[PDB]
Design a protein around this ligand. Structure first.
Ligand SMILES: CCCCn1c(Cc2ccc(OC)cc2)nc2c(N)ncnc21
Length: 208
């Protein structure tokens, strides 16, 4: 069963701003997602120092970037802490309300969209480049879920029946038709080197 939910109002407004504003420097979406992955990997690492069993679901702490030209997707995979059902449905949105208001406010005093990560809502930047985002995630204390949204004010969540992932998150960007440059190996390498070159986990850029 697929459950459908309405985003809190501030998040829907943020998403529409990201989709509608003219802003050419879209490449920043990638470092925002890699930074979120990096924090997640930090978190499971720090938690394992006191409970080694938290890594029974996978010891390797890493990030993979996988382009797929056939599906027109770019997927950012991590083996971080992952997200629970309550994170997806409710708590991340709850946390996101304050950062949204602040970011929207800064967007005058003249900030620009690239500064979105300074407000803790950098995930939404995915919508600079993707028409649909699917997030598959598995946290130690919960089941594997799929979250999905094409924006428009709503999102779905369901138990994922796909291939089990151990622990972590996969953010799958279904790219807009004019954003396929982010499938190209040279373009992804250039962005990673420019914006994400000292992430303290191995980043593997898969090739097609
Ligand atoms: C607010 C940060 C934490 C949420 N989060 C994020 C940000 C976020 C926020 C809202 C979302 O809505 C579904 C999805 C991800 N990415 C993460 C990741 N790769 N692993 C673990 N947690 C992640």
């Amino acid at each position: 069963e697929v459950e459908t939910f309405a985003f809190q109002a501030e998040i829907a407004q943020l998403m529409s701003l990201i989709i509608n504003t003219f802003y050419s420097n879209k490449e920043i979406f990638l470092r925002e997602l890699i930074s979120n992955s990096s924090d997640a990997l930090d978190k499971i690492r720090y938690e394992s120092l006191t409970d080694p069993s938290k890594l029974d679901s996978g010891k390797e702490l890493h990030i993979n970037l996988i382009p797929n030209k056939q599906d027109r997707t770019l997927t950012i995979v991590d083996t971080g802490i992952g997200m629970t059902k309550a994170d997806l449905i409710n708590n991340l949105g709850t946390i996101a309300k304050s950062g949204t208001k602040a970011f929207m406010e800064a967007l005058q005093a003249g900030a620009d969209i690239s500064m979105i990560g300074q407000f803790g809502v950098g995930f939404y930047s995915a919508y600079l480049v993707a028409e649909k985002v699917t997030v598959i995630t598995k946290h130690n204390d919960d089941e594997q879920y799929a979250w999905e949204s094409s924006a428009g004010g709503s999102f779905t969540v369901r138990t994922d029946t796909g291939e089990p992932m151990g622990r972590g998150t996969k953010v799958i960007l279904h790219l807009k038709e004019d954003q396929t440059e982010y499938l190209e190996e040279r373009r992804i390498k250039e962005i990673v080197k420019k914006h994400s070159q000292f992430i303290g986990y191995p980043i593997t850029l898969f090739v097609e």
